[PDB]
Design a protein around this ligand. Structure first.
Ligand code: HEM
Ligand code: HEM
Ligand SMILES: N=C(Nc1ccc(CCNCc2cccc(NC(=N)c3nccs3)c2)cc1)c1nccs1
Ligand SMILES: N=C(Nc1ccc(CCNCc2cccc(NC(=N)c3nccs3)c2)cc1)c1nccs1
Ligand SMILES: C[C@H](O)[C@H](O)[C@H]1CNc2nc(N)[nH]c(=O)c2N1
Ligand SMILES: C[C@H](O)[C@H](O)[C@H]1CNc2nc(N)[nH]c(=O)c2N1
Ligand SMILES: [Zn+2]
Lengths: 411, 411
C-alpha cells in the first residue's frame, strides 16, 4: 500500500503513496495488464457533490486552508448550488487550480515539470462560435509569443445537460489538411483526411496542397459547428533545414510551432469542460519521428534515406534508423535557429525524471505512463526508459472524448 | 471478457480469449498499472495436483487426446505419484512440450515466432557440478552450431525440498567479467562486477581485462557451487567492425554470439526447474544499444561519437542518437559478415506481429509485454510500437528467481 518505483540506471528508489488518492480505474486487473491499450475504459446531481467536495478538499488543502471556515462555507455554497441547479460553478481560482492539476496529473505527458506555469484563459462567458474563434485566436497569439512559446489553456463553458456542448472539432487548433488522391494515395497529413473532408462538407474551400492549415470547426452551446480561418499571421511555421545536408531544404518540409490539443475533455470537481484547447511546445520527436515518419502519416523515411544515399535494399542496414536521426536533428536545428521553443527528447526526459523526484518528495508520487513517456526513438539512451513508473488516474484530469461528429445531433 | 487489441498502423483488430486461461497475477490492479515495474510480484502436495492436472489437460489437448484414456491414466498416474512422493516426474514428451510453451508464453520475448523450434536437452539425470559443466558445454556447442545458431534449453533436475537445488550462478552461460578499478571506475562489464568477484572469491584467477569470459559457477543438488572454464573453442565471438568507418575496428569491440540465459526458473505443471539455461540468438539492439550504450554497462557512446567528429557540446545535436545507429549497423554487419545468426529489430518485430496474428488465430491470443517487446531504439518505426498488446501470465512459464548467493545456505 506504499509502493516502490526504482530507476535501474541510477538505483534511485522512490516510494509512492499518492496512488492511494487515486480514484478512477486503469483498465488493468490483477490478471491482465492493459498498459499498452491506446484508449482504455450527463452526470447526476447525486454523483456530483462527492466529486466537488473531493476537489474542494484538495483545493483548500493546497492554499493551506483545509477544513477552515472559507473551506466549509464554499463546501456548503457548492452543495447548495448543486441542490438548486444540479451543477455548480468554479471560482476563477478553482478553475486555474483545476486546470494546472489536470496537466499535473496527465500521466502520458512528459512535459509536466512546467505544470504550474500555465496560463488559464477563462472562456466560460463564451456563447457563440465567433466568440470561440476570438478566444482561440487570442490563445494562439498569446501561447505562440513570437516563438517564445508559453503554455496556455482556454476553457469554454462546462457541459450542462449534454445537448449544449462546446466543442472544438479540430483535434488540434493548428493542423495540416489531408486529402486522398485520384490514385488512392494521400496528400498532406493522412491523420486528418476525415476531418479535412468534414470541413469541405460544412463548406471549406480546400487549397488541396500539403501543409494547408485547416480551418477551425467550432461548436458553441450545442449548435451546429461553424468554419473559421485562423489569421495566417497568427500561425507560426518553421521551415525544416539540416545543419549539414543542404538538400534537406529541397525536402521542403515545414511544421507549425504550436502544438495545441483541442479534442480532449477537462474534468474538474465532477464538472466537464468539453472544449478546453491547451498548448505547450513540441518535443522534437513528435514532429521528426511520429509526424514525419509514421507509416500512416507523412512517411518521409523513403525520401530522406534516398537523398542520404543509403543502402535501402536490406532491412538490416538500419537505413530507416539512420534517416530517422537526421530528420530529428533537422527539426531541432530548424526550430532553435528560428528561436521557436522546442525541447529534445534528452532534455525533456531528464526533466521528467527531475519532475518525478519533485512529485514523489512534495506530493507522494507522480502518475506516469511509461508506454507514452519513453520517446519514440532512442528509448534506452534516455533516463525515462530505465525509470519504473506507476500509472494511476488522479483527478482533475484530461480525458479523451468521442469525436463530436459521431455524437452530435445535427441539423 | 473477450478483449480487443488494435494495431494503430494497420487498423488490424484481434480478439483475445486466451487471457481467460490466464492464471497468475500481473501486479496491476483496477487502480494502478505496474506494466513498467521490472520485477513484479517448497510447494506442498495439495497445491501440486491442480497444477499438474491443468498442465496435463493442455498437454493432452495439444496432442488431440483430451479426456481420452491415456490422458485419464496419466492423470491418475501423476495423482498417485503426487500422493506417494508429494511430487512427480514429467514424461520426456511432457518436458519438451512444457519448455516450448514456457517460451511460447514469455510475454517479454519478441523472438517467439520460433517457439516450437526448440531443442530440449534433458539433464534431469545430472547429479554433480561436473555433469552440469558437461551438459552446458554440449548445449553451447549444439546451440552455437558454427554460427548457424539453434535454440536450445538444458533442463537440470527439478526442485524437491528446496535445499537440493540445481542452480547455474551465472546470469548467462557466456558473459564478460566486470572489475572495478583503483580509481573506482570499471573495466569489462559493470553488470557482472558482483558475480565476477564471487568467482574470484570461490577461486577464479581473473585475467582482469575487458572481454574476459567468466567461468561457470555450477551448483548441483544443493551443494556449494564449483568453477568451470568453458573451452574457449566453444565460445564463438564476433569482432565488431563497421561497413563504412574503418576506425571502428580500432574501437576493438567484440561480443559473444550466443545469448544463453541461465538464472531463470522454468515452471511446468507446478514443477520447478531452477537450472534451465536456454539460448537463442541475439537481436542486434541487445548488444548495440543496451550492452554497449547503457550508462551502467559498457557505455561507449562517448567514444563512438568522438571518432565520428560529432557535436557533443549540445544535448540537442542528437549526437548520442547518431552514434547509437552507427553502433547497431556495426553489430549487425559484423555478425552477418561472420555468418553468426543475428536479427535486426525491424525483422524481429515484424516477425512478432506475424507471430501475434498466428497466436490470436490458432490460440485465441498472445500474451505480450509492450514495455519489453518494443526495441530500445527506433521504437515507432517498428510495427510493435503501434501494436496494442495484452499482457497476462500463462503457464508453463519462465520465472525470475533470487540470485543463489542471496539464498544458499553455504559451507
Ligand atoms: C510545455 C511543454 C509540453 C511538452 C514538451 C509536452 C510533451 C508531451 C508529449 C511529447 C506528449 C505525448 C503526446 C503524443 O505523443 O501524442 C504529451 C501528452 C500530453 N500532454 Fe503534454 N506537453 C507539454 C505541455 C502540456 C500542457 C500545457 C498540457 C495541458 C494543459 C499537457 C497535457 C498533456 C496531456 C493530457 C497529454 C496526454 C494526451 C493523450 O493521452 O493523448 N501537456 N505531452
Ligand atoms: C530464437 C531467437 C530469440 C530471440 C531473437 C529472442 C529475443 C528476446 C529479446 C530481445 C528479449 C529481451 C531480453 C532483454 O532485453 O534483456 C527476450 C526475452 C526473453 N526471452 Fe527471448 N529470444 C529468443 C529465444 C528465446 C528462447 C529460445 C527462450 C526460452 C526457451 C526465450 C525466452 C525468453 C524469456 C523468458 C524472456 C524474458 C526474460 C525476462 O523477463 O527478463 N527466448 N527475448
Ligand atoms: N490517431 C491515431 N491514434 C491516436 C489517438 C489519440 C491520440 C492522442 C494524441 N494527442 C495529441 C497530443 C496530446 C498532447 C500533447 C501533444 N503534443 C504536445 N507537445 C502538446 N500539445 C499541447 C500541449 S503540449 C499532442 C494520438 C493518436 C493514429 N496513429 C496512427 C494512425 S492513427
Ligand atoms: N541488471 C539489471 N536489471 C535487469 C534485471 C533483469 C534482467 C533480465 C534480462 N534477461 C536477459 C535476457 C533474457 C532473455 C533473452 C535475452 N536475450 C536473448 N536474445 C536470449 N537469451 C536466451 C535466448 S534468447 C536476454 C535484465 C536486467 C540492470 N540494468 C541496468 C543496470 S542494472
Ligand atoms: C499501441 C501503443 O499503445 C500506441 O502505439 C502508443 C504507444 N506509445 C505512444 N506514446 C506516445 N507518446 N504517443 C503515442 O501515440 C503512442 N502510441
Ligand atoms: C523501467 C523499465 O521497466 C525497464 O527499464 C525495462 C524497460 N523495458 C525493457 N525492455 C527490454 N527488452 N529489456 C529491458 O531490460 C527493459 N528494461
Ligand atoms: Zn497494467
Amino acid at each position: 500500500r506504499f509502493l516502490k518505483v526504482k530507476n535501474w540506471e541510477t538505483d534511485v528508489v522512490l516510494t509512492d503513496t499518492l496512488h492511494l488518492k487515486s480514484t478512477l480505474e486503469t483498465g488493468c486487473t490483477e490478471h491482465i495488464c492493459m498498459g499498452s491499450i491506446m484508449l482504455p475504459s450527463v452526470a447526476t446531481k447525486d454523483q456530483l457533490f462527492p466529486l466537488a467536495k473531493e476537489f474542494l478538499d484538495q483545493y483548500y488543502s493546497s492554499i493551506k486552508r483545509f477544513g477552515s471556515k472559507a473551506h466549509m462555507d464554499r463546501l456548503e455554497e457548492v452543495n447548495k448550488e448543486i441542490e438548486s441547479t444540479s451543477t455548480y460553478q468554479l471560482k476563477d481560482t478553482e478553475l486555474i487550480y483545476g486546470a494546472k492539476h489536470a496537466w499535473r496529473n496527465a500521466s502520458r505527458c512528459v512535459g509536466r515539470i512546467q505544470w504550474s506555469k500555465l496560463q488559464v484563459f477563462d472562456a466560460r462567458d463564451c456563447t457563440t462560435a465567433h466568440g470561440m474563434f476570438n478566444y482561440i485566436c487570442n490563445h494562439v497569439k498569446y501561447a505562440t509569443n513570437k516563438g517564445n512559446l508559453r503554455s496556455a489553456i482556454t476553457i469554454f463553458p462546462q457541459r450542462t445537460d449534454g445537448k449544449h456542448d462546446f466543442r472544438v472539432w479540430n483535434s488540434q487548433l493548428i493542423r495540416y489538411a489531408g486529402y486522398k488522391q485520384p490514385d488512392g494515395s494521400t496528400l498532406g497529413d493522412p491523420a486528418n483526411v476525415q476531418f479535412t473532408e468534414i470541413c469541405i462538407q460544412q463548406g471549406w474551400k480546400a487549397p488541396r496542397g500539403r501543409f494547408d492549415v485547416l480551418p477551425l470547426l467550432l461548436q458553441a452551446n450545442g449548435n451546429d459547428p461553424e468554419l473559421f480561418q485562423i489569421p495566417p499571421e497568427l500561425v507560426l511555421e518553421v521551415p525544416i533545414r539540416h545543419p549539414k545536408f543542404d538538400w534537406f531544404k529541397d525536402l521542403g518540409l515545414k511544421w507549425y510551432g504550436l502544438p495545441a490539443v483541442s479534442n480532449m475533455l477537462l474534468e474538474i470537481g465532477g464538472l466537464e469542460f468539453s472544449a478546453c484547447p491547451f498548448s505547450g511546445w513540441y518535443m522534437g520527436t513528435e514532429i521528426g519521428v511520429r509526424d514525419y515518419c509514421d507509416n500512416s502519416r507523412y512517411n518521409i523515411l523513403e525520401e530522406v534515406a534516398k537523398k542520404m544515399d543509403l543502402d535501402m535494399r536490406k532491412t538490416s542496414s538500419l537505413w530507416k534508423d539512420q534517416a530517422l536521426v537526421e530528420i530529428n536533428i533537422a527539426v531541432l536545428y530548424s526550430f532553435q535557429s528560428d528561436k521557436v521553443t522546442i525541447v529534445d527528447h534528452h532534455s525533456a526526459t531528464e526533466s521528467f525524471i527531475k519532475h518525478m523526484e519533485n512529485e514523489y518528495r512534495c506530493r507522494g508520487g507522480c502518475p506516469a505512463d511509461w508506454v507514452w513517456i519513453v520517446p519514440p526513438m532512442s528509448g534506452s539512451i534516455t533516463p525515462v526508459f530505465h525509470q519504473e513508473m506507476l500509472n494511476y488516474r488522479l483527478t482533475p484530469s484530461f480525458e479523451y472524448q468521442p469525436d463530436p461528429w459521431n455524437t452530435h445531433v445535427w441539423k
